[PDB]
Structure 1
């Protein structure tokens, strides 16, 4: 999904647009993620408050310098691996 558990993302659409958070659960079969402090609901248990999954298209991976980007891939020729890179600055993310 180009975004993984433990990544930090910026919400680019929805109610919580502009809020930064950390991906704690990823749902590849749903294209949804769980992000800290965004999309919080008020479930009636008393009435507790917790996050709800958000479509993976509404978030963007932030750079080392905190700027959102599309993520791309470069191939390392030494080991045959394949790492995620930022398209804004080229640095490794």
Structure 2
């Protein structure tokens, strides 16, 4: 996916609309991610997070506002890279 484990994201839909966290783990097969401090869950002993759909998060461009992900043709050395739109650099 375009969202990676180390990234910081903005929740754009759901109960936690407007929360900022970093991805903890990604599930490409399920298209879900674990963002820290979102949609917490009251499990039973004897409040962790549950994954949300990757469609519901947008990658913060590390320069302010969230953005959609594009790819600039690097390589140039030696493979492709993942950049921003809306002031694209990453």
Per the normalisation by structure 2, the TM-score is: 0.94
CA shift, 1:58, in A, is: 0.3
Structure 1: gaps (5+ residues): none
Q: CA deviation at 1:6?
A: 0.8
Structure 1: distance between partners of 2:12 and 2:5: 18
Unaligned runs of 5+ in 2: none
DSSP 3-state at the match of 1:49: coil
Q: Which moves more between the two structures, 52-61 or 72-81?
A: 72-81
RMSD, aligned CA: 1.4
Per mean C-alpha deviation after superposition, the further-off stretch among 24-33 and 68-77 is 68-77
Q: CA deviation at 1:78?
A: 1.7
- Residue 44 (structure 1) shift: 1.1
Q: Structure 1 segments of 4 or more deviating over 4 A?
A: none
CA deviations over 1:24-76 (Å, ceiling 9, x no partner):
1000000000000001010111xx90100000000000012221110000111
Deviation, 1:80, is 3.6
C-alpha deviation, 1:21, in angstroms: 0.3
Displacement after TM superposition at 1:79 (Å): 2.1
